[PDB]
Swiss-Prot record, chain B:
Alphabetical keyword list: Ribonucleoprotein, Ribosomal protein, RNA-binding, rRNA-binding, tRNA-binding
Organism: Escherichia coli (strain K12)
Alphabetized PROSITE patterns for the sequence: RIBOSOMAL_S19 (PS00323)
GO MF annotations in UniProt: rRNA binding; structural constituent of ribosome; tRNA binding
Name the UniProt record assigns to this protein: Small ribosomal subunit protein uS19
Gene giving rise to this polypeptide: rpsS
Curated annotation (Swiss-Prot), chain D:
Subunit structure: Part of the 30S ribosomal subunit. Can also form a heterodimer with the transcription antitermination protein NusB. Binding of S10 to NusB is mutually exclusive with its incorporation into the ribosome. The rRNA transcription and antitermination complex (rrnTAC) consists of RNAP, NusA, NusB, NusE (this protein), NusG, SubB, ribosomal protein S4, DNA and precursor rRNA; S4 is more flexible than other subunits.
Protein name per UniProt: Small ribosomal subunit protein uS10
Pfam families attached to this UniProt entry: Ribosomal_S10
Any single biological process term in GO: regulation of DNA-templated transcription elongation
Source species taxonomy: Bacteria, Pseudomonadati, Pseudomonadota, Gammaproteobacteria, Enterobacterales
Record's keyword terms, sorted: Ribonucleoprotein, Ribosomal protein, Ribosome biogenesis, RNA-binding, Transcription, Transcription antitermination, Transcription regulation
One GO location term (cellular component): cytosolic small ribosomal subunit
Domain of life: Bacteria
Record HAMAP family: Ribosomal_uS10
InterPro entries in the record: Ribosomal_uS10, Ribosomal_uS10_CS, Ribosomal_uS10_dom, Ribosomal_uS10_dom_sf
UniProtKB/Swiss-Prot annotation, chain E:
Subunit annotation: Part of the 30S ribosomal subunit. Forms a loose heterodimer with protein S19. Cross-links to the P site tRNA and weakly to the A site tRNA. Forms two bridges to the 50S subunit in the 70S ribosome, contacting the 16S rRNA and proteins S19 and L5.
Annotated function: Located at the top of the head of the 30S subunit, it contacts several helices of the 16S rRNA. In the E.coli 70S ribosome in the initiation state was modeled to contact the 23S rRNA (bridge B1a) and protein L5 of the 50S subunit (bridge B1b), connecting the 2 subunits; bridge B1a is broken in the model with bound EF-G, while the protein-protein contacts between S13 and L5 in B1b change. The 23S rRNA contact site in bridge B1a is modeled to differ in different ribosomal states, contacting alternately S13 or S19. In the two 3.5 angstroms resolved ribosome structures the contacts between L5, S13 and S19 bridge B1b are different, confirming the dynamic nature of this interaction.
Gene Ontology MF, one: tRNA binding
GO cellular component: cytoplasm; cytosol; cytosolic small ribosomal subunit; small ribosomal subunit
Stored Pfam families: Ribosomal_S13 (PF00416)
Name of the protein in question: Small ribosomal subunit protein uS13
Keywords: Ribonucleoprotein, Ribosomal protein, RNA-binding, rRNA-binding, tRNA-binding
HAMAP family, per the entry: Ribosomal_uS13 (MF_01315)
GO BP: cytoplasmic translation
Span list, region Disordered: 93-114
Species whose genome carries this gene: Escherichia coli (strain K12)
Curated annotation (Swiss-Prot), chain F:
A biological-process GO annotation: negative regulation of translation
Keyword terms of this UniProt record: Ribonucleoprotein, Ribosomal protein, RNA-binding, rRNA-binding, tRNA-binding
Species this protein is from: Escherichia coli (strain K12)
Other comments on record: The strain K12 sequence is shown.
Protein name per Swiss-Prot or TrEMBL: Small ribosomal subunit protein uS7
GO CC terms of this entry: cytoplasm; cytosol; cytosolic small ribosomal subunit; membrane; ribosome
RNA sequence: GGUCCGGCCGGGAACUCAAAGGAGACUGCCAGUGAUAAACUGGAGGAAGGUGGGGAUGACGUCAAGUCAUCAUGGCCCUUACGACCAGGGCUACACACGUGCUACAAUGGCGCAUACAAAGAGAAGCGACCUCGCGAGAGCAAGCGGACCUCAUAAAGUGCGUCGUAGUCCGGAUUGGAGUCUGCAACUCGACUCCAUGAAGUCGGAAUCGCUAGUAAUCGUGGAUCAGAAUGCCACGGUG
RNA sequence: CGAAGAACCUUACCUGGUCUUGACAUCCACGGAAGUUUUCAGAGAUGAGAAUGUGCCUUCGGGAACCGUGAGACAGGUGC
């Protein structure tokens, strides 16, 4: 699971519009609970692998996923350099 | 209970039941995606579950409508 | 012409003006007894003006931005201390002799790591 | 009330820049504002330059990063135009955008 | 309204009579006292059946006790078994909701003992 | 510890000018909330006054006379074993201690509401019957007596 | 100054605010203290007082204690391997405790209708009002809002008028009858919450593990990240007291 | 506890399905234009088909974006 599923996401991540979120702009309106066409949704759900919103992600500045801090764009282990180059602008003397 | 607004199924299972359903005096079925809700026309024959420890048959008799096959899969000796 | 004051206590965030004569105490649009009607602290907000005979000589008008009546009851104290300090230099002695001149600034060398009081140094009668 | 949010790394540079507008964008129209500050980023700065891993060598600096509102009450071209002609003074980030 | 049931309120006033009935919505009891509508102080016998026959056709299609204590058990049947939704867990004679609620069933079904 | 910084100064009460009534309800608090508890203790001095229809505040001292102590006993082992040795509580500790004995009876004491516990318990104090008088008198039956064993 | 009753929009610079450059309190002068040393007390005068407070730096010396799970690297690893791809699942049982953390034992309580005031925060892998359909978890419409404009607090206390009458209830959510949901391959033998029926221990427990001295523990709340996400962990400042 | 989410989860482990230059990344050898859309299989990895496409320098040389198969060198892990 180190470099891993990167090879599978990279080939279908960029088309999440074409798979759904712009292909939806006529047929998906009826297809909702608010609009009741029961026949329809069940025959757009087939792409399974691309099926957004799902992205395994790419932490880049760490070669492997030792977690990923979404508030900060870095791995779960990575904090200490930001006292030595300023990438977390409130990283100062601890609150404890 | 979290089947939150309508039905669903184990896909890979009910896609392959079709030749057991054809003339159902035929021997049992199996599954491992224990997630397994099933459908009304499996009736009068025997699905089964990897439990996980071993396998166990569960008999679709006359009345089925209501819960996942997880309702009969003995997963550790419950004392 | 007129005088002024402002305060910061618990957590008001209030001001006061003084006007020439007739002796009242309003809060924007209602009188004192309407804004503090059961708050046991209501008595102090006029008390060093009534001394120097306010009834025909001074008059008072409070406004507010953090209501907070249990702090406001003293935020007004340092505020009205300011107002008086330009009307009469003589009352600096009064305001001081009765405490009205003070404002909130003092902890007593308290807890930082775990020892209750933490400034007072290790101490003997010869060691 | 269109808010031109002037900023620089230093106080010296943003001073020179606002002082041109409060006079020249004021010429025939608005009482144009400019000294009126924001949460000015007076913090402390630490980058490693240790020539090996040994004691400290993370030389701590200080900053100003000073910021103000220029405010124009109407877009009135016959008064504002000098601030748009001031484009050549690249070092001050102006954030006109509203 | 001569409503179906097992019990009657005894001497208590409206707001407590109406909810000591053996299965009538206490959160509802507030609006329904104004629905009829009657005072908070009525010791229910002064309604002479007829100052409540006034909501009759509504209460003729509500669950009042005799159903909630019995006949509601016939309402589960089309959900009740193995298959999809709600479940066999009702037929099997267990606690329905709690953490691991199958495991609770010592007293319920046979064991008692730990 | 060398500095004279020790005790709590507070202001007096809102009606009659005493630190007594202020400190009294400023023990009775049991959960903070001060202002309404000061209003209940005012109602306590009125429900005392209903016993006569005069200035019964003149009897608040008269009662507290039977409830102010002299002694307190503190943690003392100075002759190799338990050795008390009371020594007196100072002139200002006299009625401040009596509040604690009035409050620790009041908490559960059974009367008709929060004021009517303190009104009746200060009635009892006046008549020497008080729970607070008995709590005082027990440390007088104990400590003030061991003055002849010290 | 106009009011068509909203700082509404005219209208001007007292002060909060926002805030940059910065600035002012010293035994200063008054009494007592003693050696007119000492310094310790009250006070002129004060926004602190004898570090004024709160953060902070945390030298050698630091237990032969760590960070040995980002450390930075010298001596040394396994390498048919401790190397890397990918679907399943099961950790929670239950006798045992024992505690950490939760509470329930009713009037210095709440319960029902009605009334007076703060904010600490986080915020385009964003946060979203008014406004439509509502028993409500939860649907929809969408103004807005990038850093006092949008929004999430309309803290809980307290106060005025009613109702129980000390009563296992009216309070106990232990929980179990049915009903539903926001996502998901995914929660069921695995959750997380909602609507109505209810109601397991309940009535003040002993011994003996340390909380907590001050603006500090009872008391009185709100936020945050990890992360396709539900921590009771912890973490930080406000305030009746 | 590390775990701030031991039911896709940064995988222990119980396994089964692939491998041991492996997922990732080079230096030369012969060659390629890069990708969009479903249908049937499969538990995932991966398997069997059907259609639609053809870019920039342009010495027509050498290649880019960018995909290949074949060489010799050659890859890694919280192990305290």
């Amino acid at each position: 699971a180190k470099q891993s599923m990167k090879a599978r996401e990279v080939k279908r991540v960029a088309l999440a519009d074409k798979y759904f979120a712009k292909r939806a702009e006529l047929k998906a309106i009826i297809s909702d609970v608010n609009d009741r066409w029961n026949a329809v949704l069940k025959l757009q759900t087939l792409p399974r692998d691309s099926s957004p919103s799902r992205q395994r992600n790419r932490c880049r500045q760490t070669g492997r996923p030792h977690g990923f801090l979404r508030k900060f764009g870095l791995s779960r282990i990575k904090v200490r350099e930001a006292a030595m180059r300023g990438e977390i602008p409130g990283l100062k003397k601890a609150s404890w | 209970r979290s089947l939150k607004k309508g039905p669903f199924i184990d896909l890979h299972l009910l896609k392959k039941v079709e030749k057991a359903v054809e003339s159902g005096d035929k021997k049992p079925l199996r599954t491992w995606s224990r997630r397994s809700t099933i459908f009304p026309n499996m009736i009068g024959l025997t699905i089964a579950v990897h439990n996980g420890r071993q396998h166990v048959p569960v008999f679709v008799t006359d009345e089925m409508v209501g819960h996942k096959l997880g309702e009969f899969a003995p997963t550790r000796t419950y004392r | 012409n007129q005088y002024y004051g402002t305060g910061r206590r618990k957590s008001s965030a209030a001001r006061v003006f003084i006007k020439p004569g007739n002796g009242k105490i309003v809060i924007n649009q209602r009188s004192l007894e309407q804004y503090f009607g059961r708050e046991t602290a209501r008595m102090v907000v006029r008390q060093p003006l009534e001394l120097v005979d306010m009834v025909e000589k001074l008059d008072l008008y409070i406004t507010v931005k953090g209501g907070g009546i249990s702090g406001q009851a003293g935020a007004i104290r340092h505020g009205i201390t300011r107002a008086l300090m330009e009307y009469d230099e003589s009352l600096r002695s009064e305001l001081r002799k009765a405490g009205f001149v003070t404002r909130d600034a003092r902890q007593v060398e308290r807890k930082k790591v775990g020892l209750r009081k933490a400034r007072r140094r290790p101490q003997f009668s010869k060691r | 009330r269109i808010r031109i949010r002037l900023k620089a790394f230093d106080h010296r540079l943003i001073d020179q820049a606002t002082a041109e507008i409060v006079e020249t964008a004021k010429r025939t129209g608005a009482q144009v504002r400019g000294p009126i500050p924001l949460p000015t980023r007076k913090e402390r700065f630490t980058v490693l330059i240790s020539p090996h891993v040994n004691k400290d060598a993370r030389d701590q600096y200080e900053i100003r990063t000073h910021l103000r509102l220029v405010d124009i009450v109407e877009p009135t071209e016959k008064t504002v135009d000098a601030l748009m002609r001031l484009d050549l003074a690249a070092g001050v980030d102006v954030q006109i955008s509203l | 309204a001569r409503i179906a049931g097992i019990n009657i309120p005894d001497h208590k006033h409206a707001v407590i009579a109406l909810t000591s009935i053996y299965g009538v919505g206490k959160t509802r009891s507030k609006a329904i006292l104004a629905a009829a509508g009657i005072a908070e102080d009525v010791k229910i016998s002064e309604l002479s059946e007829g100052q409540i026959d006034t909501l009759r056709d509504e209460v003729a299609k509500f669950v009042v006790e005799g159903d909630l204590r019995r006949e509601i058990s016939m309402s589960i049947k089309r959900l009740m078994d193995l298959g999809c939704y709600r479940g066999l867990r009702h037929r099997r004679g267990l606690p329905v909701r709690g953490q691991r609620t199958k495991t609770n069933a010592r007293t319920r079904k046979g064991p008692r003992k730990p | 510890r060398r500095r004279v910084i020790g005790q709590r100064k507070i202001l007096p009460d809102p009606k009659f000018g005493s630190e007594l009534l202020a400190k009294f309800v400023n023990i009775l608090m049991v959960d903070g909330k001060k202002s309404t508890a000061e209003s209940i203790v005012y109602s306590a001095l009125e429900t005392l006054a209903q016993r006569s229809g005069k200035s019964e505040l003149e009897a608040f001292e008269v009662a507290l006379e039977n409830v102010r102590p002299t002694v307190e006993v503190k943690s003392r082992r100075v002759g190799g074993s338990t050795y008390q040795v009371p020594v007196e509580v100072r002139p200002v500790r006299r009625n401040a201690l009596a509040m604690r004995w009035i409050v620790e009876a009041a908490r559960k004491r059974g009367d008709k509401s929060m004021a009517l516990r303190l009104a009746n318990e200060l009635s009892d104090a006046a008549e020497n019957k008080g729970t607070a008088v008995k709590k005082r008198e027990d440390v007088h039956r104990m400590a003030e007596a061991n003055k002849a064993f010290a």
